[PDB]
Amino acid sequence: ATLAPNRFFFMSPYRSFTTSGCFARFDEPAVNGDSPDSPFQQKLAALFADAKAQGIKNPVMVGAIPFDPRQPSSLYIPESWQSFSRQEKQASARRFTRSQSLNVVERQAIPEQTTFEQMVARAAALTATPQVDKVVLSRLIDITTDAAIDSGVLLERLIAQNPVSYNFHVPLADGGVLLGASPELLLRKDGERFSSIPLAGSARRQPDEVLDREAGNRLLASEKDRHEHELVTQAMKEVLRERSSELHVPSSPQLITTPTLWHLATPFEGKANSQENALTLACLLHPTPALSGFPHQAATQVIAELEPFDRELFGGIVGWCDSEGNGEWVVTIRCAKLRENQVRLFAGAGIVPASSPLGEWRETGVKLSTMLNVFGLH
Ligand SMILES: C=C(O[C@H]1C=CC=C(C(=O)O)[C@@H]1O)C(=O)O
Ligand SMILES: [Mg+2]
Known part of the structure; x- marks a missing residue:
């Protein structure tokens, strides 16, 4: 049995x-x-009362928000959860046997290696400046x-290969499915308590648990990545x-860790008003x-003048909140948009003065391979 493409699913510790x-x-x-006087929140709160009044106990709001929050949102309240x-679920997925044989007829890197290196x-x-x-x-x-x-069969494969991550499956207004295995918590709120766990900085994992346990320790030392990382944390501090x-x-x-990468993480724990x-x-x-x-x-x-596409939901956040201030939000990465026979994968880095283009090209390549493994490709 597999999940129908018009259901939201969210798998989280x-x-x-x-x-x-x-x-x-x-x-x-x-x-x-981020301000509660906002149209977004007034409308949000409007709709929650609408839902409760109309008979829905414990409404939740689910879906994704795009990179650019001006662009429109892909949220909705279900009739139930x-x-x-x-x-x-980890265990059923690891045993889910029957997969779909898929024949690719086109595969396009957008852009390809050279244009990416120039970007x-x-x-x-421009970061040196x-x-x-x-x-x-x-x-x-x-x-x-x-x-x-088949979105459902793919989701089983993704769970089996990515047991630990924030795994999501979002129905879209166009009939599509946004699907992925994010490692990055953007915001949890459990009553009054909240956390965020930003990542930044990466290294390949290795099959041998000797060169693996140390490729990591390298990550902990590499000044390139440690500096990558501090920029993120100072900003979220302020x-x-x-x-x-x-x-x-x-x-x-x-x-x-993810199955493919070492990452550097800094946990934030706070209480909010x-x-x-x-x-x-x-949103903050x-x-x-x-x-x-x-x-x-x-x-x-810089992103608009350099990237030859619109990210839309990619690099946004995906998750949920309820009518009572609680919820979880994870960054929309290690993900794909599926619709009928078309799929788009996404990956980003991670760019400061010391970054080489061959390095970041291959970094994004390893990140893309999470969703390629789900599809059975390299
Ligand atoms: C943009 C992505 O990763 C971000 C979060 C973890 C590692 C990152 C890095 O080391 O560059 C990125 O900041 C992605 O996985 O597509
Ligand atoms: Mg990086």
């Missing part, structure tokens, strides 16, 4: 659930969604297949100052310098 039905869609842009056991070069150059210190640049892989892609009652931040990062819910804080933080750059608005402008 916090709350893991599915959803059924669609009481109300919510397209409203999330810009200035249904908790499930993370560990139970990495022209971006690193007073104009920006960090920009994140991304690329895509477009895949056309000869038959519609932004949370007058938004959080308390706030604890380690000054040095720690190692975490009753003025705040899961999305006001998520996102995008961090791990997904856009630093300074944030200066780096969006």
